[PDB]
Amino acid sequence: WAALLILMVIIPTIGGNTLVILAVSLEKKLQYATNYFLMSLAVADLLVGLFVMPIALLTIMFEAMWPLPLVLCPAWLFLDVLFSTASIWHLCAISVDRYIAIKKPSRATAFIKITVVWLISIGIAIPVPIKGIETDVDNPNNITCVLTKERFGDFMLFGSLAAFFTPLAIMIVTYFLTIHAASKVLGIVFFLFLLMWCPFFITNITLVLCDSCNQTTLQMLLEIFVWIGYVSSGVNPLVYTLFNKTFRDAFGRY
Ligand SMILES: CCN(CC)C(=O)[C@@H]1C=C2c3cccc4[nH]cc(c34)C[C@H]2N(C)C1
Numbered sequence: 001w002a003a004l005l006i007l008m009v010i011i012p013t014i015g016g017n018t019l020v021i022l023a024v025s026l027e028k029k030l031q032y033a034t035n036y037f038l039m040s041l042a043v044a045d046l047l048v049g050l051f052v053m054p055i056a057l058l059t060i061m062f063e064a065m066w067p068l069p070l071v072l073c074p075a076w077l078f079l080d081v082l083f084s085t086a087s088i089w090h091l092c093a094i095s096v097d098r099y100i101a102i103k104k105p106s107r108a109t110a111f112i113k114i115t116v117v118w119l120i121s122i123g124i125a126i127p128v129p130i131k132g133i134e135t136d137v138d139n140p141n142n143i144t145c146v147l148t149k150e151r152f153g154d155f156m157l158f159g160s161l162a163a164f165f166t167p168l169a170i171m172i173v174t175y176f177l178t179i180h181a182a183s184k185v186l187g188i189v190f191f192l193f194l195l196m197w198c199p200f201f202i203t204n205i206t207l208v209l210c211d212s213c214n215q216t217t218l219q220m221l222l223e224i225f226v227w228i229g230y231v232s233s234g235v236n237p238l239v240y241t242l243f244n245k246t247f248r249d250a251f252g253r254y
């Protein structure tokens with residue numbers, strides 16, 4: 001069925017990230033500090049594909065029924081917010097980097113940047129576990145693990161504003177600023193991949209701010225769009241790494 005095709009699309013997500021990290025770790029001619037930041041995208045996307053996606057596939061297979069203990073329901077959601085957000089902000093840093101380069105003419109700076117990005121992601125993700133889910137029964141086989149509008153109403157709005165629209169505005173500004181000052185074929189196409197997450201957040205804000213909209217109608221659209229988001233997140237690092245020819249030569253070696 002569709003599950004086989006979905007699994008055949010998940011396998012590349014694990015494959016590409018491990019290929020990228022193997023390319024970085026194996027060779028020494030690609031050891032410049034800017035690749036250390038790409039390592040963060042590689043590991044984040046690898047973790048997403050390894051953990052989040054299979055749970056979603058089983059949630060599709062077993063109809064809205066949790067196949068795991070109750071305690072795991074919040075934690076999974078926490079991870080679903082921790083890694084995905086961590087991806088998006090990373091892209092923003094790349095834009096900033098290019099800006100600095102355009103106005104330019106060490107390892108510590110890269111480590112500081114990575115740490116700051118990850119702390120921002122943790123801060124955004126940490127509201128979820130502390131305020132847990134609410135259910136009428138204690139049996140995991142009778143419940144559905146979905147964030148509700150009533151329990152999380154302000155969190156969804158502010159998390160969508162912080163995680164998506166702020167970095168989006170930052171890059172929209174920095175692109176024009178760079179143009180008012182290799183850089184074109186890459187940035188234009190590598191930032192349009194972000195667009196593939198916009199429909200999820202637009203629909204989420206619509207659900208937050210509409211009191212006369214059919215919730216059931218919007219829920220199916222959200223479920224459809226979330227998978228497109230995962231596809232974009234998984235495909236971005238391979239698309240980036242294939243641009244260089246040294247990476248293409250290295251990949252075939254092992
Ligand atoms: C289809 C249902 N699911 C999965 C259970 C979601 O809607 C997830 C909810 C997310 C979410 C909500 C609210 C704020 C947010 N910031 C960052 C994310 C986020 C990530 C985002 N993940 C990717 C999908």
Ligand SMILES: *[C@@H]1O[C@H](CO)[C@@H](O)[C@H](O)[C@H]1NC(C)=O
Pocket residue numbers: 139141142
């Ligand atoms: C609730 O879980 C029990 C498990 O014993 C199952 O038999 C029952 O059909 C479930 N109720 C539903 C799915 O409405």
